[PDB]
Design goal:
It comes from Homo sapiens. This is Insulin-like growth factor-binding protein 2. The chain is low in regular secondary structure. Helix content is 14%, strand content 7%. The chain has a domain of 74 residues: Invariant Chain, Chain I.
Length: 107
Amino acid sequence: GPPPARTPCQQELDQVLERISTMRLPDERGPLEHLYSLHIPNCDKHGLYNLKQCKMSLNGQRGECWCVNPNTGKLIQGAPTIRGDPECHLFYNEQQEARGVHTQRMQ
């Protein structure tokens, strides 16, 4: 069957694992190059969240990482790509370099 989870870190991870495993395709939709956001939230053996996560896109084109302060590890600094050094210290830049874009449905 499904493997048993208990600690919901493992359960979240398995929802990503299942959907990743389902979507095996080199490219089988259309013009795609800039739409990747690959993250798997691995847990401690006692079911803490990992102290640092990373995000993948293309095989070695970048590799942002960050740390977690909270257990939810989802209080990301508002930069879903960091320049590449996981300097956790804060999340307030002042300069409105970007205001971000993420809200875009698919129809």
